[PDB]
Design a protein around this ligand. Structure first.
Ligand SMILES: Cc1cn([C@H]2C[C@@H](O)[C@H](CO)O2)c(=O)[nH]c1=O
Ligand SMILES: Cc1cn([C@H]2C[C@@H](O)[C@H](CO)O2)c(=O)[nH]c1=O
Ligand SMILES: [Cl-]
Ligand SMILES: [Cl-]
Lengths: 206, 209
């Protein structure tokens, strides 16, 4: 095995942090002890500042959808170039909390930004770079918002249909991509854990 | 018919005082309401983006593509919330830098290819463009010696000389191939600069109808 980038995806409330930890422990049980964890938007000083700009409301100013996409991308470029690519080049595996699949679902599906725009901006910012394995934790939008309880950011204040379109695109990508495996996240902790731990052990042996 | 006039040039070419000349000239020809803008900036979010772009970043390297995406992010905000709405109200707009700056600095300076610049331009701004542009040309060295007189130099103002040479070189190609861009010599004196701006501007106003 050589180093890989594994991404956890899904709506908020899908138990992403449980999944991250499951993924990490699996790799450890498999003799992989050098692992880097990341989150997006974020993971660098500047990326974290961009995350805060994206999650806040701006007074006397409408945050345009394209702006939103440009910002998540600017944060993505920083992470990929300063943290992710160098870790992989050194033989360190990277486990991330969201990556580009989130822009496709949130900005593509949710904001309804033209797919052609999505495609060319992904091209300019990332070229060909892509995760090696993504675990998309799928959950019903209302169930998910009601598990995220315990303050709603600018995106989390959007109406339900927004999350439904995000979900639909997440589903279109998950079925059309063999490097994406779907996990039913509305099960109990023992079971989400079993399916993640089983889809990854599985994937590794391949 | 509201117009959007942009003043361009390397930093230190004398942009702030050229906008004044432009503003006063428009005021003599009976143009009542004018909005002033600068880029990146001009909105609370745009200003925060300006600081991120102008500031250093010990801890990490700021990639050229990130820089490009941040100036366009600042631009989309300004254009959509301030320029277009002001133009719709019958107001003229005079801005300190616009897209030509991304072409000179990110395209020429950073050497990002024209097709990348051109597709990000389409994605962010569509076919929106200023009606007139005054490019104040100046020798790069002289440009930086003047900037220093205002205050400390930003991340970008600290690049080696060739960066500014490539940007100037790009501004000149653009000034030459575009009929809506007119070049002013900033090597001249304050009177001479003021006078060419006033005349170039004067001509353009008549040659409209
Ligand atoms: C990474 C990413 C996150 N988001 C949203 C979902 C919010 O919960 C998230 C904050 O992590 O910002 C996007 O809209 N697009 C993206 O590309
Ligand atoms: C508007 C704009 C400014 N800049 C530069 C000029 C100044 O505002 C600041 C420092 O040179 O950023 C760019 O590099 N690209 C741009 O598109
Ligand atoms: Cl979660
Ligand atoms: Cl200047």
């Amino acid at each position: 095995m050589n180093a890989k980038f594994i991404v956890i995806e899904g709506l908020e409330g899908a138990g992403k942090s449980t999944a991250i930890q499951v993924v990490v422990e699996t790799l450890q049980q498999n003799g992989i002890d050098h692992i880097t964890r990341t989150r997006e938007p974020g993971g660098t000083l500047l990326a974290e500042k961009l995350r805060a700009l994206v999650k806040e409301e701006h007074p006397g100013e409408e945050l345009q959808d394209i702006t939103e996409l440009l910002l998540v991308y600017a944060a993505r470029v920083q992470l990929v170039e300063n943290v992710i690519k160098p870790a992989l080049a050194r033989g360190e595996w990277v486990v991330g909390d969201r990556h580009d699949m989130s822009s496709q679902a949130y900005q593509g599906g949710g904001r309804q930004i033209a797919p052609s725009t999505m495609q060319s901006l992904k091209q300019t910012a990332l070229g060909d770079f892509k995760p090696d394995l993504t675990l998309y934790l799928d959950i019903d939008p209302k169930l998910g918002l009601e598990r995220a309880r315990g303050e709603l950011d600018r995106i989390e204040k959007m109406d339900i249909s927004f999350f439904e379109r995000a979900r639909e695109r997440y589903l279109e990508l998950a079925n059309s991509d063999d490097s994406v495996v779907m996990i039913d996240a509305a099960q109990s902790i023992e079971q989400v854990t079993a399916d993640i731990r089983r889809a990854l052990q599985d994937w590794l042996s391949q």
